[model samples]
Target chain A: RTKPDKWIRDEIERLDPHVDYARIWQLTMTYYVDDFLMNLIYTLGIPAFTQPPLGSIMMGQVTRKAVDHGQKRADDTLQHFWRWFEYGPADERAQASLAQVNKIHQALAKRQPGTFPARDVIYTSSWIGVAFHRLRLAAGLPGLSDKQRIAAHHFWAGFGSIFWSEDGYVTNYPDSFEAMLKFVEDYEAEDWEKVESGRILGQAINEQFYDAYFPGQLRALGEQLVLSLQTPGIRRLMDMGDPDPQAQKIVLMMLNQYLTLIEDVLPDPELSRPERARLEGIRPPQHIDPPIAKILCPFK
Target chain B: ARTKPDKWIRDEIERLDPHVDYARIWQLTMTYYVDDFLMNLIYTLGIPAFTQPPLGSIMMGQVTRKAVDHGQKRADDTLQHFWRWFEYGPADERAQASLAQVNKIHQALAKRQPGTFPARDVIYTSSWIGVAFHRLRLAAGLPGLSDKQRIAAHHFWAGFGSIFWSEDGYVTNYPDSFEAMLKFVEDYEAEDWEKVESGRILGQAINEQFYDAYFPGQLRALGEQLVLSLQTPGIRRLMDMGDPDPQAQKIVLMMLNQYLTLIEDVLPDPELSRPERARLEGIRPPQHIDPPIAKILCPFKG
Candidate 1:
């Protein structure tokens, strides 16, 4: 039963993190689906996200997505990432979704001289990998090994190329996994002054998260669960105070149990989150951008 | 170029982003700020901050077979243990190993003995170690660290502290900025320390070890005068050293800075790893740690 995991481990052990990074990433996504979505949400809240240009775009659009609020935005934003991972960038559908994101970046860059600075691009790219690596460790789970982190870094750096560099927006990406993590950590320390935009975006996302994960009377615990996961630099930046010890206790235990359950019982997730969204009658953005898969544009 | 190290360091600090290159900054400090770090640790040892009334300071409290030992020479070993954490920059494999060794030593000692290694002390000690790196530099008339380098230094230690001291169920808000840390350390140290026997013994032993390590043989008076030159009247009073001399102290300070200037001219670049660093300084093999003991002390080792 656990033999598949053993085989995958040996397979990963044989591959080089630098050269064969994509294979390792595939293994990661298959095994760590929930973590990736969690990373995405957390990624959106990194220090660079609070800058006025980036913040107003993501945060304002979030609150404006009242039709489906967090739920729809969750699929719209995160699922767009699916075709890239699921079908790879070679897929025309993946390219279309990516092109849509670039349209937004292109417009903003045209509007403002430095709307998306290279540093902010690097900052956003680092979060996906850093957040994923940090989440498991923060929850007291055995996090990614160094080899895994390096491979994850390669994967994310490549995405930055697709998002910014390939479009001629960024000249340099980053040096290494550790270097990028250090950059983000430094940015948080230096730049995470409280901002209203973060709160607006945060509230919108939290309402969506709480509604989905801990509806009704459990919203308070859901809030703590979120706060407990964030580092103090980010928590303070967002004006979120300390989580109650009670919340921390439950959140840690709950996360660990969930990971354990995934390990023991659940099959490795072969489908991306957006792929699952398609089955739920949700028009995933990556799929929506295609003619055959296009829809009435959700809860519309 | 070697004669003007202060500016070189300042220039390097300017070049190295406080965020990405902090470990390199710490490496520079580990080499250049050696005198300050050593002096600060010894001075802190003399403070009775770790005492409970009537029991004396738990400077290196004993675990005597069955009963608790109050005063011991564990001070040198414990200081070395924590020093290694900073020396290798705890993120490295070596310091992680060192961290594990220290943790195992503490855990077993806690089982046999309690009190000295309280959550508060463990946590504060990490903060104090971080605090000392900056405070001593300024106090010793070395060039003050820029706001950026200061934050980088704190960042390195905060991560180190998290690795080593984040256990014991204490929630520490490791300060964000250098001034915040200075304020934290100042507030913590403001409490009057009782003059305790354990602290004196621990302190004197540290002073003796300092002489043995760096100032042994003909440079003996250099160490003594240097210590005198660095210690304040209040610090000397706490440690029971006699009244400090202003005139003689000035000469020692000049000689110390001059020697460092000469040393820095020939010193390896800050990016050199520790062993390479040792070889460059002609301190062959580096003052070392035992490999065999790590096997015994490693928590996961057979």
Candidate 2:
């Protein structure tokens, strides 16, 4: 995991999926899981967060400030998601991220009344689980099984429910992966649309990704590689052009190399991993003091 | 802090990934309420060790300056220092810098006069941070810390105690577990609780300065009396800040309960967390190390 190996796929095939569902989420898959998550947030999440009709109603003042700072936003988000991925939601850094998310979304919903549509919340919340599945798909694995997907759905459902409580976030989450997938499928194709604000954010996001991961001369190659992995529709909204041919081939080569690397596994559960280096977290904005009594009856 | 339902709070705790990430719990239960803990530490200023010459002198100068400044610069910096650490932990730059200054401040003392800042005082003050928060939360009728959180807190403070004064071996030979640290504080306070005039003045000065700041004008005198009464009877005899009457105690307790309930049931997590509260309150750590002044040495500026 620290340094970076083969048939862990068949190794996965051999185990009971229920018990081993989390086994797929080892260190080897971190970059893939993280990349797909970034892709979703950039492609899907930002668009959803800033989605039309309710998007502006939902914008987090903290994120917009961070987004204006560009690389800090990317660095901080990666540190957060990657840390949470490495550890689990219960870890302190992840908890700060989690509580900060819960606190922010509740406020937006409480104040605006526009951000709570069932379709949008469901699509955004499902990614914690789906990122694992879709990243493997991105790497060309036969898709994660329905059983495995249910585990994912249950995982993010807690996160979703935590943020929204009993309200629109989970008007009762889907009990099955197919239902979850079907809902997101309907939303992604129909409900998803380009937002100008998202375009600006994703552009800044790509700039940071290119420099942070690539730096100096190879920044262009790094840019196109990650960009090509983005779905065509997402690319269109980002208003990015198709990636160069050789760069796309390079990305394919690396991911297949990664797919082969998955044959290995873990020393501890994801939540128990020793922390690596850290990044600054998104501290909840301390300026707007929520009126105290309304806290008991939030989102009224 | 804001009011939020205990059930929603409980559900938030339950939603945490198992093995319980202390980060979120600490925030939900501890981080947002840091000022309470910092405020409580002021009570320790009355202890005998802090009242006399070596440790006493250092404290008196500090108290005197904070009092003279009345502008609240000293008080605000101290608040931000602990508040920053409580919210962000050691990784945060402001917290680290505040702590780094603490380390250097104590380090310089050993150079001037050996054994002036007792290692036990260093360790006791460090242990005080964790225990005070736990005890304070329970006193407020907020949910108590879990055993694991208590343990997490002990080690985290010990981790900083080392950062604070381990160079002089203050953090060394310290208690190893949470219960052990509590025992050490208990043992120290037992011998540490004799009345000293300096202790009383420092104690009274801090109480007076902050009472106006912490409580409303109408409640200032009552709140001051209640805060002292919250101290153990033995401490009251030591500082001689007498007890509140029975009804006064009962009255404050009722209001405290309602305020506690309001926080638990009504408030959402504030948009302004404590770290941000420090900022909104216009508190910042005094930069212990100023930026280098032009990097010049004997006209050697290159």
Candidate 3:
């Protein structure tokens, strides 16, 4: 009836021991880069997860958590978040994250009474699922075999579905690519006006990032990467227009070339402090001070 | 305000003869305005208006007659009969009500106006109108249509060939043209993150405004339903021009289902309860509107 804490923990435990962390870490090295792609998708295309009203309010609380307790704690909170996808400490951290999420949603439900943010779980899980899915394809890390690719997709979908039961918004976890597509599509087709909390927050987040990042030839590369990462339908839908097909092909070929030569042979390392700082820099200044609980809270 | 043509006709009549009936002209003007508004709404909703084959191209050229018919149009006997809820009607009665509305306006104009009324202008006619008419023409089939209609449709589409097909690299991978349309629609449906993300952004944008408005969350909620519906085999079947895929017929049913659902939610009614009030107006699902096989309809490079 409530969040399936036990099942989610079990699924993570089952998958974590066998996970190809070396590959995951390869993808993680460009975590900020992957996150940038997600920001574009959500802001320019999907704005529900991180935008104003819901996401912004939740993030405000996270800002408070960081500002009140310090950045070290904020980093700890993130570590706990990442653990939800791993094992041992990850399971514990995930449980902590789950409890905090439950607390926030419950608080919000109390405030709003009958209505609930229907896709809160869906949005959260998608953020994690879509990112991992994209990074796996982009970095070309292992999973070339059918088994490997299926397993990769399975892991993320299961990971995302962990939150679905909490709200009972969906009946089953998305077990396949097709299933996941239908599930998310069906949910999206619902009335969005009721889901007002996400818009203003995303606006705030965008304003902060675009303002601070400043434009340049290098930063322009970041913007280009965002567009390149998108599926064609998304580019059209956002009215972001598009790049020349031949040029896009050239870019893809160059990426594949680098991937073939470097991905398996090169050493993929942990997040360096500078890289982590850059990753953190993208969030709104207000987001820095919020605790995990506050950031997750819908009532905020 | 009221229908522009009615007023112009009445003023012309007064100039010609001082004893014209003003009330009758005013009534006629209002009737034409109602019809104009309905037609205008379709264009605004971005249904492809022109360059579509037979039914579509022909529909764009028929406004003056329909506006003249005004409320006289009926569900069972006319091209625009889809409006009245059949569950709530005897098709004849609905048709009669529309006919009476138009008839009243026409009578008012005919009594005082000159020999024949001027042909009214078609609003916003273009390639867009061709496409819009195409959708309607398909939904409401034409009379005495022939095989040449297909050939004509092909030419119309070919005329705008480059603009219709997508410029995406994925589309370029395929060799056969017809297969490309099927493949593109399939790929369009298969795309997950983009669809999900785009739907959310659009829905949230709508949600952020007009919290108390009718159809508040309609666009966001219905976004995915229509996208998936776009994949129905019927659409592909109907979409065929040079090669008619029998599978395209299923899309017509799928589209109708989506349209009916969307229409029911958004139609304004004072009697709508609190639960009903919360529902937002439906939007036409995103569709590939072009020559049957293309993406970029316009020449804009971006």
Candidate of highest TM-score:
1
Order of quality (lDDT): 1, 2, 3
- Writing each residue's lDDT as its tens digit, candidate 3 over B110-194 gives 3443322221111112122223433443443322112332222222222222222221211112212322332433343233321
Highest lDDT scorer:
1
Candidate number 2, chain A TM-score: 0.67
Candidate 2 chain A, run of 10 with poorest lDDT: A285-294
iRMSD, all candidates? 32.7, 29.8, 23.9
Cα lDDT tens digits, model 1, A144-190, are 77678888777767666666532364446677888878988877777
Q: Assess candidate 2 and give its lDDT.
A: 0.50
Candidate 2 vs 3: which has more TM-score:
2
Off by over 4 Å in 1: A1-7, A35-48, A51-54, A61-63, A66-68, A87-93, A111-113, A165-167, A264-300, B1-302
Question: Model 1 Cα displacement at A188 (Å)?
Answer: 0.8
Q: What is the model-wide C-alpha lDDT for candidate 3?
A: 0.33
For every candidate, the chain B TM-score is: 0.70, 0.74, 0.23
Q: What is the lDDT of residue B63 in candidate 2?
A: 36
TM-score for each candidate, following the candidate numbering: 0.43, 0.42, 0.32
